[PDB]
Every structure is written in structure tokens, then in C-alpha cells.
Amino acid sequence: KTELKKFYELLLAKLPKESVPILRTIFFSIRDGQAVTESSLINQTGINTKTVQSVVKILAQRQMIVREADQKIVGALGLSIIPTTNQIHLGGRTLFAWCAISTLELSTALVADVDIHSRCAYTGEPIEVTVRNGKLAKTTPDSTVIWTVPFDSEAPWAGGTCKQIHYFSSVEHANKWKEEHPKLQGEIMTLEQALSFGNELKKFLS
Template sequence: MTTQHETLPDRLGSTPTGIAPGIHVPLIRLLAEGEPVTIAELAAASAQLQDAVREALEAAGDAEYDEEGSIIGLGLTLRPTPHRFTVAGEQLYTWCALDTLIFPALIGKAATVESTSPTSGTTIRVRVAADGTAASVHPSTAVVSLVEPDAPGSVRSSFCNQVHYFASHADAQPWIDAHPGGEIVDVATAHRTGATMASALLDAAAIPAPAAQDSSCAPDRAPATAPTRTAPHSCC
């Protein structure tokens, strides 16, 4: 029987948030610096006109903005969620558990994840290597919930909001009871799904994977392959 972890890469494809990878991947790398991202900065990083970036973000629908209109979230976010994602000393958050296993490979840096089980309140801690591999998991019995995303609609409400870490299969049982079509997988299986999705994003964006760095010894500046903050384009 085919299960969610096998079909998700095809269902979500290379545009899991509904935005072109050539814009989404540079946005993830900029947000990983821990600051809001202006439209001008994202346009420069993605080699797109500012109007094209605005249209892509509007079409995606789920992007988060601050009061000045700068982007603060699209999968990776500056707003608190149950999934805390620390990379190179920056305290960030993700929309779902699976994001925590996708984004390190996109930004090329290791991350520390602390996620709260929605059933027991237990904190699950995962150390994710720069290639997205789960280097350590505590408790070792931790699992991840997956669902089949609805289409069309908001990927955050139809998918992300149901993709959690749990301390164990027993901890996840109330969630399974409430979501009989869902699936519970171990973290290693979730990582394989995330790795496939990260590879698809990089391929579709035609952006090379950044040189992997251990965030505990990463230099202060961004790696050469990551987009850097530049002056805005003169035209938009």
C-alpha cells in the first residue's frame, strides 16, 4: 500500500508552498539570517523584477509580513510556532515538523530543533546536519505525523498544521484517532521524504546546494552560495 511519505514528494512537487522554487529557495536562505526580507532584497537574490516577486507571493497566499511589508515567513518564519529551529545562532521557527528536515539542506547549515508534541506537551529535540540528516533524536522513539495535502488551498492549513513531532507512537495515538487517514513515521523515514523534497526544490530552482556547514563553527558571514543582501534593483 502506498503511504503519505512515499507520495508527498510527487503531491507537493517542487512548489510545496505554491511559489516558484527560484524565489522560494533564495527567500529561505535570506530568512535564515534572522531578519525580515524586503521585496527588493528578494528580487535581487532571485534575479527577478520586484513586481514578479510580489505577484508570486500573492499567488502563494500564505506568506507572512511585518508592519513594514517585509516578508517574515513562508515555511521558515520569524514568528513563533511549536517548531523552534535554531541555525547559526538565529532562533527561527518552521510551519511544520517536516520543514525542519528540509531547510538545513537548502541553506547548507546544521540546525537544532525543539518541537512540542501537541498531545502530551513533551519537547522533542532533533539535531539536523547540514545535509538534512537527523544526527540525533531525543527521545529516540520520536515520530512524525504526515497527511495527504488537500488541493487546491492553503498548504499551511491543509498540510503543515497537521505535521507534528510526537514523543512516541503511543503519544501520537490520539492524533491518529482524530486523523484516520494520516500516517505516523519515524524520524529517519521523515528525513528521507524531506531529502527528496529538498533535492527537488534545488533542482527546480537551478540553484546549487550550498556548501554544508556545521552551524556550531560557521563563519559570521553567509556562505558564498547563499544570496547576500544587496541594494535593490533600479527597476521593478
């Protein structure tokens, strides 16, 4: 995971200084099911209104946050109040994740048991995973794995790299998909590894 730690260190170096206070404020509001506005950020963080505006613009350009058409902020750092294929029940509410990795790393980052429902990117079949006290409990199909791609400090998240990450019902099905998408580059990782990625997300938000 040296690569992941180094990815986040490079990203922090690139982001504006007030990025972490703003990202925390957004992220933990989304956790609580509450869409975020710039006025709420200004009032809560105490940051100058021009700096809030410019930081939010950058985070949105990088698709590290997602805004609906009316510009309210509804997702951040993989976590979403609006629907995706990856449904996560966490902290007594139904939220969503931007990709397969997010479904598990958010459990770790938010220190929360989760129930995950998703889909095999090849077969379309349902995938169910649960986590209890940091340990994988249910996993159906039992052979479920994740396809990931190299992380990129300049790549946008929600509509960029997150769209290239997938759940597969098995490695054999991942391989069928790969045969049909021969030019795409990536690798298989395990669900346990995805859980551990939340460590680095927590550090990033610290």
C-alpha cells in the first residue's frame, strides 16, 4: 500500500491549504444524509467566502465532490446521498458509493458496519457483502473480487477513475470482461485489501 499512501501525500501537496477542513465538513455531512451548500460551509468552517468558493471549485473540477444540477453538494470522496449501483447501508441510513473500492474503504473510514449491494460488471448479477467489526461476514458470490486501475493524482474521481473500478462475481468473469476490453489496464484486488484502503482515506482526512 506504499503506492496508496504516496498517492494521497501527492494529492494533499496539490490541493489548496483549506481543502481538508472543507472536505471533512462535506464528507461527514454526507455521512449524516445532509446535502451541503456553500453557505453552510462558510458558516461552519469560518473560512473566508472567496476561499470557500475557490476550494469548492477545485474539488468539483477534480470530481472529489459531486454537485447536483442546482449545485448543492451531494457526494464527496466516494460517498453519496444520491443513487449509484453501489448501495451501502451504514449508520442506520441508505447511502451510496462511487465504486466498489469505496463501498469497503468507507466502512473502515467511517468506523461503521455496512451492508453492501452491488452488481457484477460482467454478468449483471447481484453482489452482497457485509462487514461486522472490520471483518467480512457475508460475501455472495463467495468469489467476488474488485478490478482496480492505477491511481492518478490528476485524474478526476467520481466521473473518471471511479468509473474504471468494478466488482466482478469471480476472477473468471473478470477475465471474460478483460477479453472484451483488451486495451484497458488494471488488476484484481481482494475485498480485504479494499477494506484496508480506508486507513489511508482516514489519514488523508486527518
